[PDB]
Design a protein around this ligand. Sequence first.
Ligand SMILES: [NH3+]C1CCCCC1
Length: 270
Amino acid sequence: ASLYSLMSLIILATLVGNLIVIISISHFKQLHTPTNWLLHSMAIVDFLLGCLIMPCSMVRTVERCWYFGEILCKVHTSTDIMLSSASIFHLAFISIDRYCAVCDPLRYKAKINISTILVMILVSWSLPAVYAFGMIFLELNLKGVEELYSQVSDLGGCSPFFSKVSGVLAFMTSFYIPGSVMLFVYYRIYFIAKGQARSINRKAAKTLGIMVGVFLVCWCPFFLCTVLDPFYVIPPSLNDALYWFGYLNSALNPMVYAFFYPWFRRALKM
Ligand SMILES: [NH3+]C1CCCCC1
């Protein structure tokens, strides 16, 4: 229906959007710097996520029940968590790269060599993976809220249904730490980038605004709901609209960090 065709659009958009990043960057021997390796890796992560999770998840929400079979479920949701705890981390390390240009600008190249960038890619793909799988594979969403998951007998649907202290921990680490680093950085860049045009006069707001705005509107609603419910009036059907918000964010990530800019456009429009 409306939902079906519409959600397929998003998945395809993600796939075609990111293969572009990866084709342009790997073989051009004009783009061999430390920064691009991040937009490459984010492309990769969003790609994998898109293709495997999205279509499985897309089957699930045009229905009330998961019927794939339960041995599969746990694998699946952990993959969803891992791949996105990856996307948010990627945005934060890009922030540090950008902070480091517009502050210590005499030392930048030395500090951001390809070795640093390598650590930044391994950490991004390691800690999300591990944590998601370890948590959901040792019966650790529910420890104390076991019966409910009533919520999985009749409902039998893969919902990350979190326990009381589960919501606080998961929400905190992935939204609160990655969210805060970003805000500090962009705040300072507003004051410096706008302060300079004082001197040269005798743009910043649009760019920085559009980056932070996207992230927040796409994630704040799903995550706020999540920490709250262990304190359970929320409904099942409405709760779903929030997952898909995260997935939509993933597409627009390529447009915001690798196409708004002229170098990409010119090289791609060769
Ligand atoms: N959709 C999921 C992504 C992060 C973990 C909990 C929600």
